[PDB]
Amino acid sequence: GRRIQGQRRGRGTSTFRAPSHRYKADLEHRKVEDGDVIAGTVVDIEHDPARSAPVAAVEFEDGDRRLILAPEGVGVGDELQVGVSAEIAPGNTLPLAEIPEGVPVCNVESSPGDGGKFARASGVNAQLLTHDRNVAVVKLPSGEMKRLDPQCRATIGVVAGGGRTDKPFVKAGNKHHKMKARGTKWPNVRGVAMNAVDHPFGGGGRQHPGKPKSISRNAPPGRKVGDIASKRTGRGG
Amino acid sequence: XTXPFXX
RNA sequence: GACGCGGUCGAUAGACUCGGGGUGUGCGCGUCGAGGUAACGAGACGUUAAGCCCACGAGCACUAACAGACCAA
RNA sequence: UUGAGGCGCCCAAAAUGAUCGGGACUCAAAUCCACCACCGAGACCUGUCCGUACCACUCAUACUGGUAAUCGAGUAGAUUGGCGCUCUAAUUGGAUGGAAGCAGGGGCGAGAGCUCCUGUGGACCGAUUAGUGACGAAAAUCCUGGCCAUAGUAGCAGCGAUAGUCGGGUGAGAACCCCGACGGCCUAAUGGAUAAGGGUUCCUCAGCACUGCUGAUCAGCUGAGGGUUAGCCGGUCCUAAGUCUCACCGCAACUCGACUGAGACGAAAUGGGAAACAGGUUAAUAUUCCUGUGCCAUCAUGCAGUGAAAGUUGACGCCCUGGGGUCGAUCACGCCGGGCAUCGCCCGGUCGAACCGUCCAACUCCGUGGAAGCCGUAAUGGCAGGAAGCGGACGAACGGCGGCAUAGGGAAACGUGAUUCAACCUGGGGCCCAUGAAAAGACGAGCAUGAUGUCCGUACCGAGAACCGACACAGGUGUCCAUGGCGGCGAAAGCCAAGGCCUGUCGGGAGCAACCAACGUUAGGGAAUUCGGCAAGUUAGUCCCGUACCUUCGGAAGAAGGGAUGCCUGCUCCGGAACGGAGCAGGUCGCAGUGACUCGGAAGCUCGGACUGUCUAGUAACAACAUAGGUGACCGCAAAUCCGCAAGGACUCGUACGGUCACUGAAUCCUGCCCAGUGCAGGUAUCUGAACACCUCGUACAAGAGGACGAAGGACCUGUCAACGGCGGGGGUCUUAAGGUAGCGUAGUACCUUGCCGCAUCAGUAGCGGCUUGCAUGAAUGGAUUAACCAGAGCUUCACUGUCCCAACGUUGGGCCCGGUGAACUGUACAUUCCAGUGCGGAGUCUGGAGACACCCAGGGGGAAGCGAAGACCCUAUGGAGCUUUACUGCAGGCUGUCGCUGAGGACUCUCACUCCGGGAGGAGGACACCGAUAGCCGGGCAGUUUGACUGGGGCGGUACGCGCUCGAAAAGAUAUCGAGCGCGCCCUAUGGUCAUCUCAGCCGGGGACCCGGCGAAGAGUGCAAGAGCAAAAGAUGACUUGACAGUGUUCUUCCCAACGAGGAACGCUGACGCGAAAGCGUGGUCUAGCGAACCAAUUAGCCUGCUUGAUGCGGGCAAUUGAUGACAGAAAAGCUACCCUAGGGAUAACAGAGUCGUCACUCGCAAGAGCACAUAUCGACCGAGUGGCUUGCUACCUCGAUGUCGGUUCCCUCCAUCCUGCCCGUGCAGAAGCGGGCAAGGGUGAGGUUGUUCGCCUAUUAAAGGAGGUCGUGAGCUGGGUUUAGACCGUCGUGAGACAGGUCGGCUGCUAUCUACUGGGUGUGUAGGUGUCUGACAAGAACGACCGUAUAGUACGAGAGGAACUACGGUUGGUGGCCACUGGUGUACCGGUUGUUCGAGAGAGCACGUGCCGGGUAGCC
RNA sequence: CUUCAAGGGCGGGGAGCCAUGUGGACACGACCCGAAUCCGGACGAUCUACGCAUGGACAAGAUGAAGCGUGCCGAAAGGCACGUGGAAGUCUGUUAGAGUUGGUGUCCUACAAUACCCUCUCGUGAUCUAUGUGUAGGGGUGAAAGGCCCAUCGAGUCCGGC
């Protein structure tokens, strides 16, 4: 047969790449020798093409201009702070240690100083729960309990743009426009609609998968399709 | 090759 | 290709004129014309069975059937 | 009276024209019995010759003589002598007193071939002998070249662009080169400017050999000259997606490869961007040259300035909209010029840049002001956080204004105002799960004067002749001109300017026929056509009125239906106004007022997919794909998923409201049960589970053997179906987990099936509704339902109509004749055929007859199993490829243990390698992970392959695939079939061996046990088929025994003859044994079935042997036993292909033919029986005999280098077994109406509804509405609905690819006629100069067929009911031939009305496709 | 040689070697042509598919979503009317442009190796389009038809293995 679509993906051709050259900023937390002296003022609220959520343009005392992962509430004029001593209000960023338990946080770091990794999608937010001299348990938006180094920096508040998922796309055109600004090939042709040569589900005089859909984790690329290492399927039971 | 000559 | 007819001792074809037909009342001018100060005015009547037109007929030698070539026991 | 024989007769029906080969034959030219004489082969006899064989002579195979009654045909093939070609050598010759070759001719040889003569030619050429070899052609759809027919043929017509004509000019020559006039064509192009691309095609002169669809004096052609001028137009510069280079790293390596870093490259219309305008000029350039004016940059000098870098700009999406405003267009009036001539109208012009200066609306802001309800907009909106008003700062045009300009341009005038306003300028609003470049540069930042401003491009085309498409190709190919006039909603039609063209480049002629392409009009009927209304038509613009079911409330909807519509006169209303819009009153014309043009036919039921969208470039546009929506899966990012060999990379400037991987496919109501199998996942006492290390044995070591431990994985357990899938049989549980819930249902799923009932129609395999037992519906393999949408499938109605009845006339281009140009397909030969026959069974050529004078023109295509394409179907090949999978074997990849990196103190701590986060400090992690190596598991993701043979084709089935018996088998042996009957793949320690004793089945008699007697050659028994053998035994009983022994042979068999292995058997020997008195018997079972190679292993006894040598270990070998290949003389082995491919086959199937005729159709013989009695009016069983060649089947002869399917249609001929019609016979014949039969093929046998159907069912008519043959007549005639390609759906089956003798939607029909054939037309020759008139051998016809009515007659007959005929009349129908007074059609002759536009109006005209439309219509043709 | 033994197998009383011609066999291209393959290295995204960058294009008309306004009604919520507004993978449309349903027409040695005419669909968007640019052969690209990757596709083309 021929390589399946998932295999064409990896090659990184234009079709599968994201329009990076059209992206505004690689949102990442600022650095500070220490102290926390850093602070700036929101100048504008822009649209971020890579996340379909707003990003805030901020100006710091050291005249540094950078875009930030805008939580909800932040407006132009507002002043934000970054450091071990920053205030405990929405928009400010400080290590999990200096953050009071029970406070919604976003754009959490996985490794202190990595600039943020977790919870940075529209409306989501993490939840700092347990403190310690070593571990800072945080509940990520997926429900998992992530144990983290208390030195990992994070932003207070929930990410802006919440509720985006509530309104349906309604029409293909709308999807089309969104998909065009992402690293994704769209629309999607069903495997079962292809020829055997093209996909393990292809072929037949009627459309149905050849074998069962749940595939072993050990399956090789070219054959891993359908329900990957499913612990279960269906809704029942 | 498509039925009648040469459809 | 063939076939048929006429060729001045002629009506074969055209012109002209009739006859026989098709349309449907010409241009112009006169009167009327709702009105409009007037300018103007769609249209109506008359002149006008008008004007225009005919692959048919007739009359009619005016024009063209001239000149003349060839084959043949 | 009866028996027998001979010849004949009846029985006796077939398709183009009858037959014994034909003629024809009757006391024969038949038949039978005899006889006589002839004809007639290459046989037979005979003369001569030749070859071959043999004999005599001979060196000879040289002569000579002899023999052949017992020699003379031959494909494949074996054997042998010879001819010819090239060049070498030896020997030896010829040629300018004419070599070779070639042409024609003479001679020899059976022949390959040799030789001579004449001519041509003009320089080489042989012979003999021995050699040499790219040495001999009729063939290969052979190769290359040349050439004939084809043929003076097709094309130079078809396109919404139909284009020309008369004069004249030049010229040797003019339809097409040029001038004028007249007439046309193009209007987003046929005009203007350009990008790419071409590359000189541009201009001039000179030409016509080439090119130009004809010609050419012309030319994009040929030749020669010439032509492209830039500070201010492009390039150049900048950066975009992205590319390259260098470094680094990888790789065996590189011209390879990802990242990172630096550098460079990357935009000529169409990204950003310092600066140029006007006029003039050449044959050809032009913002480039020239004249005038202007501008930019840099630099130098001088003055100014010390500011100077923050900021602005470059610089930005989609939708709506306001304001400013130029050109253009139009209106008004003035001036200049032209046009027209009934009027007073109509056309053109009325110019003037860059630049310099100046003006500023919008936006923003400031002061004042002080709104509590006001201000404002097209709209949104604004405000005590300060509204309006007033004043002010900032601030626009490619715009206004002044200059530029006693510049330029114009023959002249050399205007002024207005409206609507492209460009350009500047605002307001709305949308995004979409956020709409960057950099150079510029501004910020003065002025004078001077200097410099190089390099590259510049011609022309830009297309129905300069580009791509082989072409001067009807194709393809980007940008700007979108504001020329009328028209109108319009960048629409139609008409017309400016500009361009008559080069979508061959012409001339015939009322110009048939036929064809496009098209107009057709009376009455109105879908009867057809698979189907295909094609065509109807409708139509605008306003008013009015509008159903259903619905997701959006829609449906322009539903439907109804009315109006022009011109002229005078007006009203809206608005600032328009040369804008809406109305009113009166008048008035036509058949018609959206008058042409432009311009929907409407309604309903059902299926499918929700919708817009996608797709098979080039037969599928669809129900298929997509989609939003629904759902499940994986993953916390050092992730999941994916790419790379590696270095590395996509996702990712991303982070669960994410993105990956899949399924379903809008909404609405819903989505039952099953975890047994398979999959995935989790768990797991126990079991299983590799390698390293470890223990034991072994080996001075090692190989090797065993053990212990045991990872993932498996067993086992659990979870899971919106995971693959499943949802029955039986009874009032069984398989295998459950056993079909809501729904839906004869379905695009239902075989039966045209299911049944209903609707609808005259009639409805259709359609719809209901029922529904569902061959074989059913829930995200989604079920049901559903508004809207649709070049989707089916059906109904109104309307419409040449689809049809049934065809006609017309129009345009061809066709036909002429001038010019000028192919191709195809060709073994011969060829005037026709009817029959025969033949490899489908003949122009064979056989018999018939017909036939030659040549030519036109036609429509019957035949040449026509041309074209080495059949796609089917089979075959130890062919190919794509695809699948629990086929065979492997390879990646994933998981897992182990070793190395790797370090300190069965679980644990640590830091120092190593990894990651962090700019760094330093944080996390940590001997793990990564990486290298290895082991186990999973592993169609990928690779290579296999997947047999036989066979009345193949497949399925079977195995006649290794063996044995009877029969077939034809009295030796041998002998086939998917021939008939049936067996073997073992069993037995005795069921073997010997010896002794003995005789069995069955029956009879005496006391199904046992005992006694008799009969009893064999029917018993002997392991198992069958056939055969056996009686003091080969059987039974008893006893004893292990010969079922080791070794080695002979022979037969396997395999007749006749080679071939294993296996088998018969019969010996040697050795050792058993039994018996002994002879002797025992080489398994009475005989014929019970079987297996090499390699390798194990095993038995002895021996040989391993690389200088000894010892030990472990090997190699001689002989033999056991282990299986049943496809049985031995491969280790699954499928699909409709996506297909190749080699072939008529060695083999499908169609058709051919043979057959069981089947089918029809008949005959006999005649039981019934028919109230009566076989025979009528019906007619059994059985028996046949005919046909329509059905079906069989066969495998013909065709696979192609004989096109079914049905239909059209057009022609035929058969008779006759449906009607004519003439008849019988009757259970009163009549009338029937029934059965005979002769008979002249004519007729029709129209419709369902279905692709043939068939058939049904309706109404009818004299009747017969059947069959012609390659199931007819595709170089049509059609294409079904079968039968590629797309898709449903059901069933399959793990899957995919399948179906199931259904369903869609799905390209090639070719110029050489021959023959016929229909018509000519030219010749024959009869042997003429005119006119005839004859008639023969030939053709259906030229006529049939029905209804009246009189006969309410009569004959009949109780009545009912109800004939002969004959004579009238008419109808079908067919036929002709004709046009009449009716009707046409009538792009003609005349009229009228719309739009153009010629100023008027008059009179052109165009609107070959008439704008409407009305009428002559002749002719019908 | 096998062998207690016996019986078997093979060999034995001197003819070969070389050369030249020739018959035949085996490997090789193996008498000649004949086909679908398979493999290697290269050349192609001037066609076309999909993406990206930078530009361009869409007469005219219809329908009239939200939002806003005015008026009426209401205590309010809010309702109704009219207007304004101008939304839409919206409608009509040969605007330009794109597409390709039927005629199973014309053509079918064509004008054309996919054309012509009429008919027909879309035509503000998942739109069309120019130029530049990326992806390469068991690989791309694919709203999936085994479609397309220069008249070439169930594995392009060229040359080589041959």
Ligand SMILES: CC1=C\[C@@H](O)CC(=O)Cc2nc(co2)C(=O)N2CCC=C2C(=O)O[C@H](C(C)C)[C@H](C)/C=C/C(=O)NC\C=C\1
């Ligand atoms: C015209 C022709 C051959 C003739 O010169 C010779 C014949 O008449 C003999 C014949 N041919 C036939 C039956 O007898 C016959 O049925 N042929 C010819 C008509 C369709 C199929 C045929 O195979 O269709 C099959 C289906 C049955 C699956 C598929 C579609 C194959 C088609 C194919 O390869 N066509 C080639 C054409 C061959």
Ligand SMILES: [Cl-]
């Ligand atoms: Cl999304």
Ligand SMILES: [Cl-]
């Ligand atoms: Cl000889």
Ligand SMILES: [Cl-]
């Ligand atoms: Cl240029």
Ligand SMILES: [Cl-]
């Ligand atoms: Cl505004």
Ligand SMILES: [Mg+2]
């Ligand atoms: Mg993309």
Ligand SMILES: [Mg+2]
């Ligand atoms: Mg990031």
Ligand SMILES: [Mg+2]
């Ligand atoms: Mg999909």
Ligand SMILES: [Mg+2]
């Ligand atoms: Mg498919």
Ligand SMILES: [Mg+2]
């Ligand atoms: Mg596969």
Ligand SMILES: [Mg+2]
């Ligand atoms: Mg499906």
Ligand SMILES: [Mg+2]
């Ligand atoms: Mg499915």
Ligand SMILES: [Mg+2]
């Ligand atoms: Mg085919």
Ligand SMILES: [Mg+2]
């Ligand atoms: Mg002989």
Ligand SMILES: [Mg+2]
């Ligand atoms: Mg000699």
Ligand SMILES: [Mg+2]
């Ligand atoms: Mg030969």
